[PDB]
Design an enzyme around this catalytic site. Structure first.
Site, mmCIF file in Angstrom:
data_model
loop_
_atom_site.group_PDB
_atom_site.id
_atom_site.type_symbol
_atom_site.label_atom_id
_atom_site.label_comp_id
_atom_site.label_asym_id
_atom_site.label_seq_id
_atom_site.Cartn_x
_atom_site.Cartn_y
_atom_site.Cartn_z
ATOM 1 N N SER C 19 -0.986 -2.193 -0.282
ATOM 2 C CA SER C 19 -0.125 -1.838 0.842
ATOM 3 C C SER C 19 0.341 -0.388 0.845
ATOM 4 O O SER C 19 0.209 0.330 -0.149
ATOM 5 C CB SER C 19 1.096 -2.758 0.881
ATOM 6 N N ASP C 133 -8.055 16.145 0.712
ATOM 7 C CA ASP C 133 -7.262 15.442 -0.286
ATOM 8 C C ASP C 133 -8.051 14.299 -0.944
ATOM 9 O O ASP C 133 -7.586 13.184 -1.029
ATOM 10 C CB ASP C 133 -5.995 14.896 0.375
#
Ligand SMILES: COc1cc(N2CCC(O)CC2)ccc1Nc1ncc2c(n1)N(C1CCCC1)CCC(=O)N2C
Ligand SMILES: COc1cc(N2CCC(O)CC2)ccc1Nc1ncc2c(n1)N(C1CCCC1)CCC(=O)N2C
Ligand SMILES: COc1cc(N2CCC(O)CC2)ccc1Nc1ncc2c(n1)N(C1CCCC1)CCC(=O)N2C
Ligand SMILES: COc1cc(N2CCC(O)CC2)ccc1Nc1ncc2c(n1)N(C1CCCC1)CCC(=O)N2C
Ligand SMILES: [Mg+2]
Ligand SMILES: [Mg+2]
Ligand SMILES: [Mg+2]
Ligand SMILES: [Mg+2]
Ligand SMILES: [Mg+2]
Ligand SMILES: [Mg+2]
Lengths: 263, 263, 263, 263
Positions: C19, C133
């Protein structure tokens, strides 16, 4: 962050070491900034039998001081209808925690710890106590020396955290379900020494409990004793773990054994 | 289980509290069974720059003793080509560990801890040190009072176990990649006080680091300051966390602020 | 214990895998009792920019399917003003979790995983995406093959439990605080491959972050590359980790390198 | 990362769920990418008695399939002198793990799980098995329904991790140290249902085992049964936990009880 008064003297709490119900043990400092432990019992809910149990311990703990330094020292206490505070020696770690952490044990340290255990249990025996439930948790390492602790009636003491229970039970205590004797502590001690020798209790491998209980009482379950360099060690364990308490070695016998007597 | 000699006096080790490389910190007892800490550095592999760094700290740590008791005390040390041993005050817990454990902070204790932090940082500033990397780990709770620790050149000290690192970085220190000033510690301290106020650092919610680094330097990222009962608290935080170091509040200013001066 | 409907078809949830906010990923089974994943996003609080971000990903994720099977597959989705449900491939474990668990990597598997990574990143580059990233968390091991995941705008996805974040940042992205290019992903990938080669990222040893950030941009900080049996491996890493992005190797170059092309 | 062949069909391993000695259980997928479990036993060291024990289970497990779907299904097996592989249903979680994780239980789900347990134990009873050691670990939640597992001779199965054992023992089994009967499983089941009712086993509070063992056999230790909204629930528990097995309720009785029969 806090502090406490026992018999006029003020103690500042460093940390909670452990607890049961309704007991807690603290590591504290005195006015001279010296390290002690304080056991706190909350009596607000204690029944007569339990009150009596805590009184008995404090009394025995007091009496046994004079006769051996391998019982945890009590220095002072305050006792009311509401609470008990006992100021006590503070060791480094209990034996159980220590055994779980340990790579392996130096034969000298094992033998030395064995002598301390014998002396302690021998002592309570001379004063009419027969523990009957000895375990590694019942010993405190204080300055390289084991001392008996938590040896009283209802003593469910366990370490706290910032985030076996049957491997030691003697066979006669199982069958008994007038039949518990000094010999029962010899069993239990033997199990601890077996642990310190073989890295495991005699029935740590049997994880089901009906099955483990069965194995402790069953004489056709030969316990294993792999040969080691210390033959005396081997014989002590063999004599401690004899299932017939009558044929089991006694504490006064064990104190005359070459394992403890010959360098 | 062990012991050590610093300048003739013998200390017995209770437990390892923490370590870095090649440093370790111990909780120990002296001959009078009193509680201290000993930091041990292994020099066997230290380069000149690093040797110098450890020398600088010991020197500053010595000098700063005289001028404030909100810097950890050093009592004695032994230093050779092989090792350093420093005998020091032993606190209860560091601020970082403590903050992580805490339900919530009492406004009085927060304000008091704030005063200690200011005094400590004010002190190093008067002696030409500008830390530039202050964090909760840089403070030790000793008898209810925070003292500055681990404030030296290369100090990667971390607690040990028996089994953020960027939330405090000031904006001018980021942009700078001749531009680090006293104001940078004000930022960092503000971030700690913000934590103690709101239970969280100003950018604890941004978990990606490119994104978090960006947010610290970005003036169109309004930092939140929900109203609280203490309006002075609210203004200190607002003044500490101004991104333009020139418009940021100074330590001598903060020491005159009503938050610290009015009961 | 529960179930869900995406585009008419019913899926029963086995367990929550991970999550973020306001996203969750589930391991589920379809009507034919076959294993899939479902990503659930709660839009109840999403601002325009964020809505757009989740739309962009679903769109790219759709388009990229056709052009490479080293991007996680999306099979179907339901999207309303209230929620998104995306039915997706379910891998075994993400690369980051896997790397932390691993004794060591087989050179063949490393090389193979390297090929997959290159193909994936090469693919997004051909479609005008430059991630900027990349990290081990951005790859999913599915049937022995790595596939790119969580590669979208604001993707703070983390595994759940039943009870570095800067080691990959490219130097040009630091200095930039108009200057991020494809080369930046080459850095990041190199760092992952370095990890898979040396068991550690190039600056895992520097734990203070001001200091680690400094080291990444500093050319007089020679990165170490101990000799290994695979000289090609050694040259790829050396070429990926050149600080001047202009002198850094490109993805189309890396795909022609002997490390990936010669058996 | 691996795969296995049982009776010609290939299965790919997702993860190890649990193990004993020399057994392991895996969550696997078949050629149609459907989810199953495979239990693997290594026979390389098994003695005759143990070989026989594993043969008995596979045989019973086969026979019981036909008579109830509340016993875990076996689909196929390969058995040699070297190994056993059994392809089996794969549930969600075992009851013990589940109970430890749970906030609280919905009365409907409790009653439903109770019906499944009764049916399973009733079934083994009709085929001459009397388990005598039932525990929460002996039940698997599969699609909202409990099924009996690990019910064979020597079954020390425990979940694995990526990083009570006596609360259920019936009194007659203790005293017996020709005296174990079907009633003993009623005790154990009652203890599980008591857990599901009161969040605790009848003697979870007694942590010393000599003391806990004593309490189970002692009739002057009144077990507590706080009033609840479900009076039928209250009577079932009271009837299951009668210490005299002769006065304890039977499984065929329990299946006629209003708790299970009236909506
Ligand atoms: C720092 O001092 C201690 C630390 C530890 N631990 C460190 C944490 C680790 O996880 C294992 C337990 C364990 C024991 C001590 N020392 C200690 N002194 C006196 C008593 C006592 N214990 N305890 C401990 C409470 C839980 C076990 C022993 C009970 C016996 C007693 O009456 N007193 C006063
Ligand atoms: C019992 O004393 C302590 C315990 C703790 N912890 C208890 C364990 C828990 O997980 C958090 C850390 C933390 C700090 C102390 N006291 C303490 N005194 C002096 C120094 C020092 N630390 N430390 C600690 C080493 C790691 C953090 C601080 C470094 C600063 C220093 O020079 N000295 C001498
Ligand atoms: C059983 O399946 C998985 C298990 C794990 N873990 C097992 C637990 C352990 O602690 C490490 C994490 C990790 C990944 C998967 N498989 C998996 N498939 C699809 C996605 C996905 N992840 N994830 C995971 C959510 C957290 C990290 C990856 C996000 C990418 C995505 O869109 N989908 C659909
Ligand atoms: C994903 O599937 C499962 C996951 C778990 N857990 C998730 C991890 C958590 O910590 C608790 C345990 C527990 C059980 C299952 N499912 C499952 N199916 C079939 C069997 C079986 N178990 N086990 C498990 C092995 C350890 C306990 C039950 C033994 C019974 C058996 O013959 N089979 C084939
Ligand atoms: Mg602990
Ligand atoms: Mg811990
Ligand atoms: Mg810790
Ligand atoms: Mg985990
Ligand atoms: Mg687990
Ligand atoms: Mg875990």
């Amino acid at each position: 962050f806090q502090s406490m008064s026992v018999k006029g003297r003020i103690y500042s709490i460093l940390k909670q070491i452990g607890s049961g119900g309704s007991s807690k043990v603290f590591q504290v400092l005195n006015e001279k900034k010296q390290i002690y432990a304080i056991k706190y019992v909350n009596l607000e809910e204690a029944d007569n039998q339990t009150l009596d149990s805590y009184r008995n311990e404090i009394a025995y703990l007091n009496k046994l001081q004079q006769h051996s330094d391998k019982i945890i020292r009590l220095y002072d206490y305050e006792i009311t209808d509401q609470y008990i505070y006992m100021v006590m020696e503070c060791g480094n770690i209990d034996l159980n925690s220590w055994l779980k952490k340990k790579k392996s044990i130096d034969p000298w340290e094992r033998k030395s710890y064995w002598k301390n255990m014998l002396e302690a249990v021998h002592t309570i025996h001379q004063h009419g106590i027969v523990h009957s439930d000895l375990k590694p948790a019942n010993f405190l390492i204080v300055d390289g020396m084991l001392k008996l602790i938590d040896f009283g009636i209802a003593n469910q003491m366990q370490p706290d955290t910032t985030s076996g229970t049957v491997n030691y039970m003697p066979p006669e205590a199982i069958k008994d379900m007038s039949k518990i004797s000094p010999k029962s502590d010899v069993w239990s001690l033997g199990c601890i020494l077996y642990y310190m020798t073989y890295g495991k209790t005699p029935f740590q491998q049997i994880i089901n409990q009906i099955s483990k209980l069965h194995a402790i009482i069953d004489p056709n379950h030969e316990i294993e004793f792999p040969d080691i360099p210390e033959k005396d060690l081997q014989d002590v364990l063999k004599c401690c773990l004899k299932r017939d308490p009558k044929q089991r070695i006694s504490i006064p016998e064990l104190l005359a054994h070459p394992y403890v007597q010959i360098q």
